[PDB]
Symmetry: C2
Subunit: 188 residues, 2 copies
């Protein structure tokens, strides 16, 4: 299973995209690392852009299935989200490279990305309609801001380290602040 | 318009698009119309060059928009305005985070003081009871900054979620302020 060519390319692609981004990624390196010929990569994914889009989409589905947005347990959702990122740092890294490469332009799998968010937003909205979470802020914006506080530390680990100190006492302390902040934001 | 100024500018542009490891001194020299040796004469080495360039952009923002506990919403407005007008800062900060991770920074001491000052401004606001103290000053500053800057890290998520163009940008702005208030309100 993990020996299948498609699986090897997938994994090598992740590693390569994670380090060098989309433009800096080298198909040759991916091929070498996957012990697969360059033509095989194109046979399974068509082109570099499609390959990145596919790899990213899969990691996102994994997180979406493992940690669905849950308005009835904001704190538990935050805990699971933080745990996942710590256990799988490739996702956020790929997301950053994508943001840098495409900026505000349409994405290769634009439609699929739209649905991805429409579902998460719906989970937030449902919580608003049921009055479990504030509706002072729109559902999408609300989801975005909660995600911002949970992932910011990954973007600037030097800022986190210097502001809350290294060591578990800081990570854990921060996790606690994120949850207290999320509560104040969604309450009522 | 001296050469040190040209190198600085070229360095910014270079670091902004290629990061620290991917940055090329030759490119910076060519773009600055300055010999490679001159860059080392004025900044010593690539790492020192980056640290100097980043430190300067941060001092600029720090002086232009001080952490103000007595006007969190105005502070957020000015913060958002500044990043939109000077996108190099956040970009450089991301590259730095990716390059050093959790390791000591070249100008570690200077960075420490930088944050100690911002933290102090939030603390002061807590001590005066203008801002909640349910959350520690440092963490409080961090979370506020997170909401303000996350959109620049993932422009695609912002665009899809709150809409692109001025409508989306202005809507997120309002939400950021409302969220910040709920977080700090004593």
């Amino acid at each position: 299973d993990p020996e299948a060519t498609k699986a090897r390319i997938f994994e090598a692609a992740v590693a390569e995209f994670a380090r060098h981004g989309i433009a800096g990624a080298r198909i040759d390196r991916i091929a070498a690392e996957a012990r697969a010929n360059k033509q095989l990569i194109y046979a399974y994914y068509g082109n570099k852009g499609e390959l990145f889009a596919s790899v990213l989409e899969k990691k996102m589905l994994d997180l979406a299935i493992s940690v669905p947005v849950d308005p009835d347990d904001i704190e538990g959702w935050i805990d699971r989200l933080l745990d996942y990122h710590a256990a799988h740092p490739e996702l956020l890294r790929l997301l950053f490279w994508e943001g840098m490469e495409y900026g505000t332009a349409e994405l290769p799998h634009e439609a699929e990305r739209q649905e991805h968010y429409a579902r998460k937003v719906a989970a937030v909205r449902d919580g608003q309609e049921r009055g479990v979470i504030t509706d002072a802020i729109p559902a999408p914006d609300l989801l975005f801001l909660l995600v911002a506080m949970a992932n910011w530390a990954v973007v600037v680990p030097q800022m986190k380290r210097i502001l809350v100190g290294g060591g578990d006492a800081g990570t854990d302390g921060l996790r606690d602040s994120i949850k207290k902040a999320a509560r104040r934001i969604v309450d009522r």
